[PDB]
Design a protein around this ligand. Structure first.
Ligand SMILES: CCOC(=O)Nc1cc(-c2ccc(C)c(NS(C)(=O)=O)c2)nn2c(C)nnc12
Length: 121
């Protein structure tokens, strides 16, 4: 992957705010369907995603484009809405985190630019 202004923003602004939020803990590592006794979790949720995975990917320059990281956040949130029941608190927690995600994304740099300057030519 690479380091861009938008990915750096997703790491140092967006993930920094979401990771430390009071509602973050169920999303900080993959859903552990075995420990949770949920044999249908991986039958219903075909692309699991969580903030621990996204954070490690940002730390390791896994992404080539901010849009890929944004889609991972979206998948994490949508997985939660799809698997759980409308009135569960976890849905409200996902919704609260997603609102912050969108609020912070609104101030992301407009043009995706590489931050690593290379020798000209
Ligand atoms: C009622 C049946 O539905 C569910 O249990 N739903 C979900 C449950 C939990 C969940 C609970 C308890 C614990 C201890 C954990 N820890 S973890 C991240 O290691 O697996 C997670 N996360 N979750 C996420 C995200 N999305 N849905 C759920």
């Amino acid at each position: 992957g690479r380091v861009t202004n938008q990915l750096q923003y997703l790491h140092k602004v967006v993930m920094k705010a979401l990771w430390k939020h009071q509602f973050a803990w169920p999303f900080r590592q993959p859903v552990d369907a075995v420990k949770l006794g949920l044999p249908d979790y991986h039958k219903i949720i075909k692309q699991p995603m969580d903030m621990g995975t996204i954070k490690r990917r940002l730390e390791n320059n896994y992404y080539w484009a901010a849009s890929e990281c944004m889609q991972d956040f979206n998948t994490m949130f949508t997985n939660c809405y799809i698997y759980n029941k409308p009135t569960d608190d976890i849905v409200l927690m996902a919704q609260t985190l997603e609102k912050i995600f969108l609020q912070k994304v609104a101030s992301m740099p407009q043009e995706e630019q590489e931050l690593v300057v290379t020798i000209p030519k």
